[PDB]
Amino acid sequence: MNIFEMLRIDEGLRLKIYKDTEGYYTIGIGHLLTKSPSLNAAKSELDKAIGRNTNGVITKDEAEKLFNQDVDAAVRGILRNAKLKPVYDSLDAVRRAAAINMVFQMGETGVAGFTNSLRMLQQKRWDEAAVNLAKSRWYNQTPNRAKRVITTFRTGTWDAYK
């Protein structure tokens, strides 16, 4: 298991524009296109993301290319963030995958708002971080996915994904 396989399980793959759990136009493997309610604004972000006239449909290769870029950008976002970087550097490799999953889902500003959980993760107080992470809109909106990520932070294993 690795971050790519983890996020493919949590995000799925759709080759045609769709609306994510929040109602936002999305394509591929969780590639958010726009928060705007306009489907034409989404298609136009799609053509620009891909470099051709898609008409709202992409192939598997293109979905995988977006995915690769997004994972890369989440990693680099973590490493440039003053709050996130010290936390990420303190973690083992499995639990690093969980941090990237959160950032991928909610952006770096989002995760950097989990101040209390971050501190408990840094101190390696796993059970206490799991409890604090669960007290969140994120957990209440997407509990199944949130539990998978929380368990990964809690145990340091891929069990929730196996």
Ligand SMILES: [Cl-]
């Ligand atoms: Cl892009």
Ligand SMILES: [Cl-]
């Ligand atoms: Cl979920």
